[PDB]
Symmetry: C2
Subunit: 216 residues, 2 copies
């Protein structure tokens, strides 16, 4: 109930961006998983707060990198890049187009036509300040193991719909997916030197940031 009145007021009141609205329309036309406006604003916040200094930039692992990427590019420091990863070629065309239409230079974005877990093995460790992942619950754990090394301290890994609306921790709900999402959550909460925040956005967002060195 109350979630939607908040959503409605925030959505019906956020100044519309043409490039963003276009990317949201495109994603919907192709049936792609697209984080809502509130989740995107939080992506802009993290891209803006995370440290661009010494950072290559951000990584967006999702079929709809255009929508997500636009939110990230809004906050990211100019001397960093957005690296998008998806194996589908029309998704590469879909993304580069949206960036082109928005006023973005090609030098700010990089698209890797690959399966996420295959190419992350080819990126530099400790070089990224932000990683957004939109994957299947069965890939969550692998994505965490793949992304963690790439993340810099003060860096955040953002996992969309990772909580399956709370579906997890439910006797009735036996499922290949629910069980994988449950193991991911339990696994994520077990890693050391990580800050875990699980928020009421989309189907439940898990953001895990790499802790800085602490005396306490």
């Amino acid at each position: 109930n109350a979630f939607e009145y908040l959503r409605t007021y925030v959505e019906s009141t956020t100044e519309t961006d043409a490039a963003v609205a276009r990317a949201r329309e495109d994603a919907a036309e192709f049936g792609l998983p697209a984080p809502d406006e509130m989740t995107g604003q939080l992506l802009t916040t993290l891209a803006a707060t995370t440290n661009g200094n010494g950072s290559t930039g951000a990584i967006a692992i999702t079929p709809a990198a255009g929508l997500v990427g636009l939110y990230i590019l809004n906050g990211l420091a100019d001397n960093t890049t957005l690296t998008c990863i998806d194996p589908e070629s029309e998704h590469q065309r879909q993304a580069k187009a949206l960036f082109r239409e928005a006023g973005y230079s090609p030098s700010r974005v990089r698209f890797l036509l690959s399966r996420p877990l295959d190419v992350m093995s080819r990126l530099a460790n400790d070089s990224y300040q932000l990683v957004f992942g939109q994957v299947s619950p069965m890939d969550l754990k692998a994505l965490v193991d793949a992304a963690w090394p790439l993340l810099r301290r003060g860096g955040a890994l953002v996992l969309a719909d990772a909580l399956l609306d709370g579906t997890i921790a439910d006797q009735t709900r036996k499922d290949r997916d629910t069980q994988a999402a449950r193991d991911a959550d339990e696994y994520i909460r077990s890693i050391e030197g990580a800050h875990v925040a699980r928020l009421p956005l989309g189907a439940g967002l898990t953001v895990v940031t790499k802790a800085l060195e602490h005396h306490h």
Copy 2:
């Protein structure tokens, strides 16, 4: 409906912290406004992601600075301080005690026994990476004007319950408060070089971070 199952699973699954649980019990015993566990985790994330370099640290403006402060201290870099602000002396005793009980050194915290809007005039501009405010809707605008100058670029101002559960933008709802919260929201969305994210936490959280310099 779905918000609580997510909340329940996340709350019932977040590894309990003694110092934090104590601060949450204390706040409840004194009837103080206390952000839930999910909002606190997001505070840790921002304290961890924002830049401690060249920053004095964070500011917590709230009657329950102990609970809020503990979440912030978890992420904040060691070479920064948490500045708490409240005019009530038992709140100062309440906070310093909770920090003392948690393993925190007195050098990491600073308490200013003052009314927020009176003392912010006495702090250094462009020196803070994070400011959390828990105020009345009638003080929101003034808090933004007071906090903005103190915030560094890449810095975030976090305003608790600023959306009044979406209550705003409602013909029926005439009110001294709703009208002030509405003007604050409209005013906040008008400032330039600011990233505004409004999220479904508490009664509606507004976080506005100071944008970095952008060519785009």
